[PDB]
Each structure stands twice: as C-alpha cells, then as structure tokens.
Symmetry: D3
Subunit: 297 residues, 6 copies
C-alpha cells in the first residue's frame, strides 16, 4: 500500500524531488529516469538510474522534472504505459491547452495527470482561488522574489560579450517587477553596449532593469525565493476586505515537495487531467481523514 514513484528528468528540482520522496513514509522510490545515465552524482550512487521507465518495473506515478518544452510529449507517453504524471509545467498561458491534451490520454489508459503543481503555478493558484471564494469582486496581485529568474538569466547569457549572467526578480508591488542583472564579460567586450543590449532585449524592455558587472556570478546564486499575494475586495456587498499571503522559501525544495503532495492526491482522483484547484486540498496530505479533519478544520 506504498505509493511507487519514478523521478523523470533530474534538473535543479530533481535532487529535491529525491529528498521529498525519501522523506515521505507513504512513498517508495523505484528509480530515476534521465538522458545521461552515466552522470551519477553523490545522492544517486545507490539509486537505479535508467533512460527508460519500463526497466524500473511497477510504478504508480512519475514526477516529471524535465525542461518545460519536454513535459507534454513525455506525460502523454508515461500515461500511455498506465502510470500517473505530476508536473510543475510553469507556462500559465498554456495550462488550459495542456490539461485537455493530457485528459484525452489519461482517460483512455484509466490514469491521472496532475499538471502545474509547483508553487506558481501550484500552491499560489489555490490561494488565488480561495481569495475569490472569500471576496469574488476586487483585485488580486501576485508579487515574486527576491529570487533568481532562470528564463531572464538565459536571455542575458545569450547576448554579445556575456560570458555568464544572473537575473534577480525584485517585487515592487501590484505585480510590477525590477530586474537586477549581474554579468561576467568575455575578454575585451564593451560593458556599455552589453548593458544597453540587455535593457533593449525583449525579455527586459518592459521592466525597470539594472546591470552590474562582477568577477564570479556563481557566488551570487541562492535558490531562496518568495511571493507576497494581496486581495482587496467585496464579501457580498461589504467592501475593503483585506487578504495577504507571504512566504520566504527554498524554491526547488517547495516545488518538489508540492509535486510529491500532488502525486499522493493523483492516486485518489477519477481518470483525467487536473489543475491543483480541481483537487480536494486534503487529498494532498498523508494520514487518517478523520485525524486530519480534527487537526485542520
């Protein structure tokens, strides 16, 4: 009666998913799937590492920790082997489309896909939904950071003269963001041009962007992140109801842990694909339903 889980892809959240699975008494790690099976860091010395999930035998659910571009085709194929999928698919504009592509397949093979089950999308999605349950009229804002931005880091690293780069994301309220960019230059490159180029780039040209040159970019890195959500609005006909939610957290630690919670929940839903706002919150937790109700409600 132990939930049998495979970690597919082993990026930044990969190592943390390993820890989150190991830490859950109700889960059993049946192995790690990845492209390069010979790259075996410290923590995978004693873990089965394959490039094909079928070699791991019986698997209830797969934590997809792959790049964003890979998640769709990868989920389709693992659902098709009669295994559940959980992913942290992070592109909001495409979530509706991903859900219905995976629903077709999930239903055919009588399995469950939980999608976009990180912290945003994920956790924060539920808190945003609760805010409209409490006060349907009014405005919600979601403020991110301070934290590293992999997307914007890549966009900076991809510009003329830039050896390495790091974009930080700074909240300025009402969903507005400042971008602090730290760069190493390539032997003999013009800072002022790199600066102007980064600010003019389409990934930065909408935002207050600041660029500083540095020696080692890696020594500035910290996987700490944060959100501050607010809702101001109306319960029935009563205005100026004020709600607020904040966390200062380790990014991959949380992303991975919520995926493990989603996986637990995936085992209890009727066949199909779900966003996390379509799952009963208590389904995410381990323990006796009645002890959990006594403790939480």
């Amino acid at each position: 009666t132990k939930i049998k889980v495979a970690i597919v892809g082993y990026g930044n959240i990969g190592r943390f998913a390993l820890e989150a699975v190991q830490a859950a008494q109700d889960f059993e790690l049946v192995g790690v799937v990845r492209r390069d099976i010979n790259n075996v860091p410290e923590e995978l010395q004693n873990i089965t590492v394959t490039n094909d999930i079928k070699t791991l035998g019986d698997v209830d659910v797969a934590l997809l920790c792959s790049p964003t571009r890979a998640i769709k085709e990868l989920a389709k194929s693992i659902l098709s082997l009669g295994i559940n999928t959980v992913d942290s698919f992070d592109v909001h504009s495409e979530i509706v489309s991903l859900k219905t592509e995976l629903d077709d397949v999930a239903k055919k093979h009588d399995r469950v896909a939980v999608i976009s089950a990180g912290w945003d999308p994920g956790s924060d999605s539920i808190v945003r939904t609760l805010m409209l349950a409490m006060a349907p009229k009014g405005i919600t804002y979601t403020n991110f950071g301070p934290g590293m931005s992999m997307g914007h880091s890549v966009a900076a690293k991809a510009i003329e003269g830039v050896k390495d780069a790091l974009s930080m994301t700074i909240p300025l309220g009402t969903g507005v963001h400042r971008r602090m960019v730290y760069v190493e230059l390539e032997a003999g490159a013009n800072f002022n041009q790199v600066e102007q180029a980064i600010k003019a780039d389409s990934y930065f040209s909408s935002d207050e962007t600041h660029v500083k040159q540095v020696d080692s970019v890696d020594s500035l890195k910290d996987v700490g992140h944060g959100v501050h959500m607010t809702h101001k609005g109306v319960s029935g006909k009563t205005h100026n109801q004020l709600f607020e939610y904040s966390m200062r957290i380790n990014n991959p630690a949380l992303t991975s842990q919520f995926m493990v919670s989603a996986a637990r929940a995936s085992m209890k839903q009727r066949a199909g694909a779900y966003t996390v706002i379509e799952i009963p919150p208590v389904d995410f937790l381990a323990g006796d339903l009645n002890t959990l109700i006594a403790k939480l409600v």
Copy 2:
C-alpha cells in the same frame, strides 16, 4: 440555471447572507425562514418571510444562519426535504461527529451538506491544509483578532453585578490570546468583585484578562476581525520554510460570503456531507471552468 437559495435563521450573519446571495448573479433568493415572521427589518420589506421552508416552493440549497446548538437537527430536517445545507458550524471538536450524522441523511435523500464553511472553521481550514501540502513537518499557529468574542461576552454578561459586557480577543502570537473585557455595572455593584469574578471564571482563567468599567458598551462594538496564521517547517528535507497569511475583514460579511461560495460548490458534489477541505477550490467560484483556470492557475 439560477441556484435557488433559502436563508434559514436570521441572526448576525443573516442580514449579510442576504447581501451575499443578492450580490451573486448566479443565485436567486427564494425567501427567508425564521421563528418570528413579524420582526421584518428594512431589507426584508420585499422578501418572502415564512416560518416554514415548504411555502417557498423549489429550493436547491439552504444557508443555515441559526444558533450553533440548532444546526444539527435543522440540517437533518432540510436535507430530508431534498434540499442542500451550508452552515458555519463553529465547534472544531464536534466537526468530525457532525459530518457523519449529516452524511447518513444527505446520502439517504441524495443531497449535499457542506459544514463548517465560515472563515474559521472554513477559509482558514484550507490555508492550514495547504501549509501541510507545502511543508508537512513543522508547526502551524492561528492568531485571532483583534475582534469581538460573542462566547466570552456572554460569559461576562452572566456574572453578578454586570448589566452589559464586551470581550475583545487580542492575538499575542503562537495561538496565545489576551482578553480585554468592558463592563457596565448594575446600580450599586462592587467593581473589584466583578473584575475578580470575571478573571476567576472558567472562560477567562487560562488567559491574560483585563477588565475596564465603561458608560455605553454598545459604542465600543465593531464587527471587524482578523487572523494571522504562520507555518515554519520542512519541504522534503529542507528546513526553515516560512509561510504566513493575514486578513483584516468584516466578520459576518466574510462568514456569509463563504457560505454562498460553499452553496455554489454543494451543487457539484456526489451526495454526502463535506468539510471545505474535501471540495475542489474552483467549485466555490462562478464562471466558465476554462476562463477561471486561465485567470487563477
């Protein structure tokens, strides 16, 4: 395609439930049930007011706004007429017991009961559940106020020499509370005895309690309330994950609005009784599932 709702009982949250229903385009108020039908305040001039729900014709769901002691027997009888119930039943220790008493009846008549659907229990219950989904190990604290305490107000009002009383509830962190009590005395009563009596009473004897004498107690009343919840804990094996949620809100405004959200949700569940941590969050909301996902997730 309008959800047809009756308000049963018309206490403090009664008037606010009226506003919350009227404000929801997807609801139709089919009338108000109560013991004294001749008490008809401003807002019920034009509303059907009966002492018998059967006179209202077809009703999908009933918002129970009766005293705590009445909710169980009242829900049983309205479920038995083939109507759904939503209540803000506020006694945590008895929620598990109420759920299973109402489940029996709800299932027999093929209806839904959503129970303890205020803000605590209610909203806060979901946020407490999300906190364990994000970080299962660690401590959660729920800090209440500043706000009026009806229970402790009554306990003070019921002591020798006390004409009127008001207990405020002040948060001091880690679920610890200070109680500020304001009293009018009866012609010739000894303040020092009333003070000592209130502090010694079993409703106050565990808490830092302060007593001040005043002229009009009514002029101190404000239905404003608040919560500050915190969770410090572990995502997988990563410690010192910090989560926090705060609101400054109108108490009955919110309680009533969340009951209306629960009623909306009640129409979509399989027959039985539910706490709000057993309902998909999005079921609480009005609108097209796909627009809501696009907006929230």
Copy 3:
C-alpha cells in the same frame, strides 16, 4: 437640542451621509434634496425626498453631496436661506478661494460654512497641521491608496476605443504614485493604441502608468482606500523626530462621517467660512465637554 440636517445631492457619498446622520443620536434627518425625486432607491423608500430644501421646514445645516463643480453656487444659495453648509470640496488649489467666497455670504446671513471636510482634504489636513505643531522644520509626505481614482477613471473612459475603464492609485512613497488602469475595448479597437493614448494623456503622462485589458471592469471595483503620511523633522533644535499616520478605510463611509462631524462643529462657530484646521477638534464630537476632556486629553 437635536441638530436638524438636510442631505443636498445624493451621489456616491449621498447614501453614506444618510447612514452617518441616522447613526448620530444628536442629529434629526429632516430630508434628502435632489434633481430627480422619482429615482428612489431601497434606503429612501421611507425618507422625505424633495427637489427644494424650503419644503423641509426648519433646517440647521445642509450636507452638500453634489459634484465638485456645483458646490460653490449651491453653498451660496443655502447659506442665503439662513442654513449652515458642510462640503467635502476636494480641489486643494481652490480651497483658499472657496473659503472667502463663502465667508462673505456666511457672515451676511449670520451662518457657518465648513468646507473641504472629507479625509483629504479634511482629517489628513489636521494631522498635517499637527505635524508642523510638533516639528515645524522638516518634510511631510502624503501617500494615497491602494484605491479607486474617479478623476483618472473618467480620463481613461474618455479615450478612443475604451468601453469602460478603472484607474487604481498605488503609493510608491514620498508622494510618488503608480497608476494601474483596467479597460474594456469597443468591438474592434486596437489595444496598443488605447494603451499608448492613455499613457500619453495629460492625466497619466507624469506617472508610472500600466494598462491591462479585462472582461468586466465592475468586478474589480472596491471603495476601500488608504493613506500613509510621514513627517521627519526638528522639534526646537532636535533633529530626526519621526511621525507617521496610516488608515485602511471605506472611502465614502469616512468622507460622509467626517462631514456629519463638521456639521456638529458648524453649530458652535462664529459666522463665516472655515477649513477644518480652523475648528477646535472637540467641536466635531458629541457629548458633555467635561466627559470628553476626561476621556481624550
């Protein structure tokens, strides 16, 4: 010894002025004056509604709840019938000019005009004045919101292709403001042009302005507002004295309630026109002077 009050005009603050008058035991509502007497919303079913203040008999004071452009001529005419005026006239640059136009008339007919008696101008005006009484040298800043901006909403609504609009006002400190604008477009209009047009407009071209397109603009509305005032400065020869005042409030609720307080005060001043910084604070309050001093000083 009951203060006899007429509400002249019935806009947004009109309904709230009705509530503030009704709530004050020391006031008697002698009726509501307005252009269209046949528009009779819920709360005026039982209230005298005339299109001429003379039909209400003896009236001590009039709460002018008309548009900004109407206040001057309207106050002149009601003072001229031997009635006191209170208004929330909200154009700071014109307050000195309005005071002396109303002083002439108020003195001739032996009556009192209290002007600009909202929260800003109004309440905040007194706190700004107290800050110089405590520390005459140094800087004061007044930070507004988050709150709706009717002026900027109208300026946005009045641009090509815009069906409806809503400007929010966001405080960024030191009196600097961000403007968040939400718009519905008219069937086939170009977002990018409307966006650029709004940002270029004279109401927005000085401020960090952001424009988002939305479905229902009404569902974003909340009459909640707020101020954070600061003063850093010198008491005698001692520097770095720090003062701060904040509120999160229902906008029209407060505006109307302070007008009722100003009306109470108007009954105690020598004939003429006054800003609220020229009235003894205690004159705004109901009750026995000696009980109020005992309670407050």
Copy 4:
C-alpha cells in the same frame, strides 16, 4: 508682532524649551526664571536669569517648566500679573479640575492659559479626538515606549537597598505595559528582597515587571520615547475602519516644542483656560493663514 516669552522653571524640559524658543523667529526670549540664579549651565551664560518674572519687563506668555505639583499655584500667580501660561501638566485625572481653576483667574485678568500641552497629554490628545471625529463608535488604545519612566524610576529608587534605579516602559499592545527595572544596590543589600519589594510595590504590582542589577544606571539612560495609537471602529454604519499613528521622538524636545506652539496659539484665543483639543490646529503654527491653508488643507 514678536511674541515675548519667559521660561519659568528650568528642569529637564527647561533646556529644550530654551532651544524651541530660540529656534522660532516669531518669538523673543525675554529671560529664564528659577529658584537658584547662580546655577548657570553652559547655555544660560548669555541669557537673563532672574528669580522673579517682574524683572523681565513686558512678557506676553510664560512656559511653565516646573514640577507637576507646582503648576497650579504658579499659573494662577503669573496669569494674575496679566501674562499667558502654557504648561505640560501630565496628570490626566486632574486636567478637568485644573482647567476650571485656571479659567476663573485667566478670565478675571483677561489672559489665556493653555494646559496639558506636551505630547500625552497634548499632541496625542488631538489625534485621539480626530479618531472619534472619523469613527465615533469602536475602541482607541495608546501604547507608550520604549521609553524612560521618571515616576516609576523614583518609586524604585525609594525602596530599601536601592542606590540608583531606572524603570523602562515597554508597549505590549491594547494599552498593556511591561516594566523593565535596572538597579544599583547599596554595599551589602539582598537582591532577591529588593526585586520582590519592587514587584510588590503599588507602582509595579499591576504590570509584568522584570528587575536586573547593573553597575552604572546612568549609561542605560536615553530620552528617546514613542507612542503607537490605534482606533478600530465605525464611520456612520460602516465597520472595521482602521486608524493608526506612531512616532519615535526625543521626549523633552517634543514636549517643549509643542508648548512653544501652544504659546503661539494662546495669543489668538478669547480669555480663559483651554486643553489643546479646544484650540484650532492652525493657531499652533507660524506664518500667513492663506499660505498655511494652501500648504496643509
């Protein structure tokens, strides 16, 4: 048109009153009155120092900087010479009584007495009054410190075995206070007895009191102080209106500066005694009425 001021008494606030007068271009220091004229500290090397106000010639107003017990008889006698009085008389329970004793005398000699014109009573008094003007129903709390407490310091210093003592006042919210007491003992005295004696004393027996023994008590002294006031309440019929005021200030710097502002104001009132909630706020300020209105309202 220069206001001619004498400083009577030269305690702690004495030196600061000197600075506040000197700093005000609209004031002329006509001298300092005191018991011992031969005690002439640094700042009074160049200032007229008499033991009798009559030697200073024509004086518009006197800043009484004497001990609390002396203010009543001292104000009576200076009013009786046809001079205005300002004091920071700090005993709230006795303000109503002091006002009417000074009113009798002030009226007889056609002069003005402003009383209890420090920061509490004083400044804070006006902000407490404004809070009821904005929201008459609800609760106000006044939280003091962290700051030195001269009254409680003296009560500690007056106990067996105590060489020197210092009581700090710590705000714990809702007007509740913690008292931190630091003591030097006399050669061979029992700490545990002194501790228990201080906690049992009538000045401390109501409050959370902590006692630490220390070497130099003087090196812990700082004249910094602070207040955090809150009001939660009702504007008309709208609940959960939230108001807040905070300052971190030099205690005597502010007390003295507000007395100088009160003195300025005293010159503009009809004969009699006033609390500061009975004076128009703008009367406290220097400058042209129309520039001040333009700047503040």
Copy 5:
C-alpha cells in the same frame, strides 16, 4: 596553502560543518573524529572516521562539534598536539573562564583557539559590540526564535510521564521569552500533573510556559531559528539613536559556517585564545585583502 581541518564530534552541527568545510575551496577535510566510529551515516561513507585525531596526519585546525561539557578538556588536548581549535561553546557566564584556560595552553604550544564562534555567542556578539561603538550609552536587547530549545527540550523529556518533548522559544521583546512545550505521554500518565510539573520545573518557572499534548513530536521539529537585536541610545550627546538586526536562518547551517570562518581567521592570529570580538572581521573571509576592502568598506 589549503587549510587542513578535522571535525571533532559529529552531533547536529557535525553534518553541517562537513558541508561548510566541503563548500570552502580554501579548506581540505582531513577527516571526522567521534566516540562511535561504526555509526557511519550516508555523507561519511567516503570520509576517514577515527576516534583519535593523530590517525589523520597533518591537521592545521579542529572544529569541536562535541557536547558543551566536553569542549574544555578536548580543546586543551588538541591544542597540545599543536592543532588550532574553533568551538561554538554556548555558556556566556563561563566564556571569560574558558578563554584564559585555553590561552595558557594555546600560548605554550604556539597555536590559536577561537571560542564561542557560533551565532550567539558568535555573530551576535560582534553586532552587540558594534552597537556600543556607535552609541555607548543606552540599552541593547537580544530576542531569540521562534526556534527549538535543546536545553529546555531535555528538561521537559526528563519529567515523570513524558515519553518525548519539544520546547519552542518565542520572542516577546526586551529579552523576555514565551516557552511552547509539546509532549507525548507514556501509556497511562496524567496530563494535568505533567503540565503542572513542567511549568513548576526550574528551567520554565521564570517564563510564560504553555504545554500541549501531541501524537508525533518529531514531525513538529524544524532547525529554523532567528534573532531580533535592538539598541536605543546616545551617540556622543545625541539621544534616540535606533539600531536593529534580524535574521531568519537555519540554526546548525549558520553555527557551522561561522566556525569555518573562525577557523580561517585562527590561522592569522598570534598564539592565544580569543572571543570573536577580539578578531579583525576581515580575517574571517577568504580572498585578496585589497579586493575584499574594495567590495566591503
């Protein structure tokens, strides 16, 4: 030119010291010393583990991660082998005494001992020292938590009927602390007696103590901690200078990392024993002195 370090003792901070050493390019881990050499957890599979430091060959410095009672005799013996010691010796009252016992020995063998180099004592010690450098007169307070208390946990665990226990430490300001205690009872023990016993115990009888019974005590544990230090005081003759320092941190992560910084610094001091307030701050850092000055000063 790599600093050769041995970890002596392997408690809670032991594993974290391993990570802090490994993470420092300027250090080389020459092995781990401990009482039970056969207990070899995950991370020590490939690390030399001895019960005698002499088996590790050449060692510049030893991180003592032993119990408090062991540190003195253990430091004496390792200094005596011509190796440097760093410890987080956490008993403030005994630091002066430990320094001079280790100074004698350190000087004899021409080595360095850095003592009490955690975060308190340690980091916080330097910030407390800086506060007197900036403002020698006035008060400093050090507020701990929320965090686990091993000392108080042990004192609770050692009482009749208590299977397991956990004491949390909650800051209430001005160095005052609340203790939240969570206990498992032994089959058939009386909660009310255990509660009373814990509150009466000498480790708790001075503090606001609260006791709750729970199922699993281990699932409440989180190694997160925090400090909030304040100083209010006088720079020269200028009062009300306000300073503040806060951190929310992983306890052992920080303790261990600061010991590694102290070890780096130990290599640069003249022979003897030191508290961390006796070491130049820059000596704690790796890198070129002139680059570090350019970056920090």
Copy 6:
C-alpha cells in the same frame, strides 16, 4: 591614562565630534584646529582654538573633520608630527589607495591611521563583512535614507536659475535610489528649464528624480538619516539564509561618535593604516576587557 585628542577642521561633524569627545570619560579634549580662529560659536567659548596643532602640546590622536579633498595631505602631516589620525573619508573607490599612502607615513613615524571610520564607510562596512562570514555566497544590498545628500544638493545648487537647493535620497530597495530635489529659483527663472536641467545633470540622470519649487529650503533640512542592509545567501550548502540590519539615526552624531571609538582603538594597533574591518571590534570600546566580554559575547 586619558586619551588626548585634537579636532582638526570644524565642519558639520566638527560640533558633534566635540560632543562625542566631551561625553567619553576616557578622552581629554586638548583643543580645536581650524583655518578661521575668529569664528568661535557657542560651544567653543572655553575651548583652545588654534590654526596650528603644535600649540596644543601633547596630542595622542587627531579627529580629521576637514573636507574630503583635504584628508590625505592633512593626515600625512599630522602622522608626521607623531600623532594618530581618524577620518570618515567617504569615497569607497579610493579607500584602498588612501590606506597605503597613509600606511607608508604611519609606519615611518610609528603611529596609527584609522580611515573611513564613519557609518558608511565605517559601521556598515563591519556589518557587510559579518554577512559574508555568516553566508559567503549570495547578494548584499545597502539602502540609504531617507536623508539629505550634500553632494547632490551642491550639484543642484550649481545649475542656472537655482538660488538654493536640497536633494533628499530615498531608498527603493536593491541599492536603487529616488532623488527628491527642492529648489528656490532666482528672480525671473523658468521652473520647467531648471527641472529639466537638474534631471539631465550627470549627478541625477541615472536615478528617478523629482523636482519641486519651494519658499524656504532651509526649513526642509533634517540631519536624520538611515540604512537598511540585506543579505540573502548560503551558509555552507544551506540556501535562503536571511540577514537584515536597519538604523534611524542622526547622521553627524553617529559619524563623529564612531570616529571617537576608532580613535580609542587606534591607541592599541601596531603602526600602520587600517580600515575598520581590520580592527578587533572590542578595541573600539572603553572598559575592562573581561567585563566587556562577560557583557557582550
């Protein structure tokens, strides 16, 4: 055993250095050096004021309170008389260069120079250094104000049409700054040109700059200042370690007091020049080493 100190230069910090020296029992003020000896304000009535340090006899150390441009040549010459120097030399980019110019001279004459010993550079420098000792990897930000900016004030005052000017420095986080500029114009100057000129100037053209015209610029001046430093980073391998330090302070009061602390420390170092991150923190303090350790560590 008194430290004998001369104040050389008497600018803004000059007067405050006088107070800081006088306030330190362990110091003796042997006199003040300056260019204009006939300018003798209140506090220098009784102090020896020479234009030549040699007239003061024996001097252990000199507090250089001269302009930035003078400090180098002035320190060289006073070191050369066998006297120690302390300065608040405030140009970060040139600190490394100044240290080594003064080291040469300090060593030749067997004396000590402590340089850049204000609060930034100074105090803040030590806190920035401690942050890397606690968490070497991650980002530190230093946020200044709100406070006056002498440099930017001068740059504004030096533009066409500007009679007087004041630049305030406002922190917006992540080392980003807003500049609020207040100007008096010269009889017949165009505001819009002066505004544009100030914004375009090289001292402002990188920063969010706002310009307001005013009557008296002097009445806006307050020497209050502040810093908020943050560090987010890694202790060993543990991420999201959060550190924060804030102060609200009198600028020259603090600068001068830390120079007096540096002077005390200068008496204990081997001959040479030092930044404050190269001095043992406890060397800054007066008192018995063992009492200080007992009190702080």
